């Protein structure tokens with residue numbers, strides 16, 4: 074088409090990322106803005122508020138973010154990288170919406186000669202005046218930096234030698250690297266700061282008078298400090314797994330000291346929080362302290378409150394955590410209500426008001442890889458009734474979750490609610506299928522299906538939380554293919570060990586037996602054998618299923634090989650499935666096998682593609698149901714299908730006969746099969762005409778068969794299968810087709826106009842649009858690196874010109890090639 078017409082239809086943009094960012098390294102939180110901050114090893118900074126409020130930034134040096142400090146009240150933040158550099162970020166409103174940008178940077182450097190092991194920043198303390206940064210270092214010296222306009226203030230430095238001179242003789246036995254471990258401001262006096270050193274010396278320092286007001290020397294090595302809200306109590310934690318309480322009123326002794334998980338030797342308690350409540354029952358949250366021999370491998374955060382104590386246990390390393398408190402600066406009590414934990418593989422939020430401390434559902438930042446993703450499947454425009462029933466069944470399985478509204482709700486989302494409901498289904502290694510709301514900026518878990526059901530298999534107070542599982546139990550359960558009929562609520566899922574399940578949406582629970590049917594694909598091949606995966610043992614007798622997608626029939630391929638293709642026709646109530654050996658058709662109404670076809674006689678018979686079509690196979694006048702299969706060797710099989718009417722659906726059996734066998738002479742694997750109607754419009758989905766008679770295919774004009782191989786596109790006329798058009802992609806451009814999907818491209822110049830075209834993902838990671846029906850290449854975009862074999866394998870298209878691919882094991886990148894779609898965040902955040 075003309076280039077002016079291309080610009081109304083096609084335009085490539087990567088718009089948003091969905092999921093849990095790879096390898097987090099720092100956590101920050103602003104209690105005034107109610108906004109979460111996450112830094113990564115790659116130098117990324119990511120901010121989150123209410124759903125729709127999110128920002129991303131990148132440090133120019135791609136070094137790990139180690140600390141994030143959102144300035145009190147202000148719309149600013151200071152990050153620290155592992156190269157010891159500090160950076161000042163801000164949220165300025167440009168164009169009525171907020172945006173994140175880096176203002177300045179600063180590397181604290183000592184006089185030439187001083188080792189870097191001395192100027193290494195340990196603690197960053199933003200002063201309540203919002204004008205000064207106090208910087209503790211491994212040498213024991215506290216430096217002061219002005220804000221904004223980064224400038225060190227050498228006259229305000231608090232050195233270790235200046236502190237030790239104000240102290241008695243027995244408190245002066247310093248180490249070479251005093252190592253500032255704590256650096257805090259008095260909660261009720263901006264003139265006093267606490268400095269804590271590794272060897273156990275803690276001082277309270279009068280900034281204006283340059284003198285020590287208070288000090289103690291703990292018996293154990295110091296790890297961290299917490300200053301009670303009123304400033305009259307200090308809690309320290311130590312390298313032997315103990316913590317002490319200290320009064321603040323000179324040179325005192327501990328009020329209390331204990332190793333919470335003794336008497337065994339314990340690992341350090343590395344962070345501790347002491348939080349008051351109006352009810353007079355304080356919270357004690359601390360990280361670590363595990364018995365070294367039996368639990369040293371554990372990633373724990375313990376919570377003590379009102380005689381109750383739980384050691385929350387996470388399956389990945391704790392990167393950082395925070396506790397949301399009802400209190401603002403003025404409040405007398407802290408009153409915690411949520412514990413937010415950033416682990417290396419997931420975010421976890423705990424409700425601290427509700428007894429039992431239940432988890433909070435995530436609206437975003439979901440660990441898509443809590444079981445490894447093995448396939449995906451996108452469905453656009455969901456019927457509202459089906460959508461509500463999915464969401465309903467999701468709530469029923471999430472009853473153990475807290476009812477607390479999402480607390481990290483800062484900012485204001487400026488984007489209207491999505492007009493269209495999109496679903497992204499993910500298949501996983503453990504046999505689960507998750508239903509994600511892919512409509513807008515936030516990818517939210519709506520419902521989870523577990524297919525493992527149909528097959529056969531206190532001190533410290535550990536409680537396992539989170540969802541990430543690092544262990545691979547049974548790879549046979551892995552979901553390979555997914556087909557959801559958004560009209561009938563039927564669902565077909567296919568697995569790694571030849572298992573094919575057809576399921577149906579149900580509002581209520583059910584107790585039923587899953588009917589098992591074997592599909593032997595080597596029936597006409599004696600002497601064969603199967604090396605490897607034994608079939609999954611199915612549950613005999615009835616099984617109880619919660620509300621959701623409930624399986625009623627299991628088709629077990631023999632041999633139980635990886636199911637390599639799947640198609641479901643919800644109107645004819647048939648399911649087709651392929652393996653490396655052959656393919657077969659199954660009547661899931663009668664729960665009987667219609668036919669089975671082996672493909673190993675002229676891998677090569679490897680069935681890549683399956684496609685139902687009501688089109689012309691023999692005569693130009695009558696159009697019958699049909700199934701099409703494409704193989705790795707360029708072969709296309711077509712089967713005429715006799716489907717009884719509604720009344721006779723259970724009385725007479727469905728009949729099939731091989732009507733066509735087309736061979737592509739270039740002999741490349743068939744990746745896509747499609748039929749266009751008389752107006753060259755692709756045939757509609759099953760039950761789409763039943764729900765919309767305007768989509769009834771044109772039977773007046775001649776139908777055309779589109780076959781896409783890895784090397785070529787080809788259009789034949791039906792029923793003769795006479796060649797009409799072709800595009801030799803690999804010959805022309807040197808690229809190979811990885812996958813291809815039909816996509817409707819609407820015009821941005823005409824409100825209600827659009828054309829169907831082919832979205833094509835190549836083995837070079839490119840994304841091409843090939844026109845229909847003429848097979849002319851329209852646009853080619855760079856998207857995924859050609860070396861990114863996992864990202865290319867994970868890429869999935871939408872029906873209307875969007876797409877998703879995995880940039881990491883745990884998050885998608887959303888791209889759009891259509892001018893009608895641009896799902897990006899737009900939000901406002903102010904103080």
Ligand SMILES: [Cl-]
Pocket residue numbers: 083084085
């Ligand atoms: Cl463009």
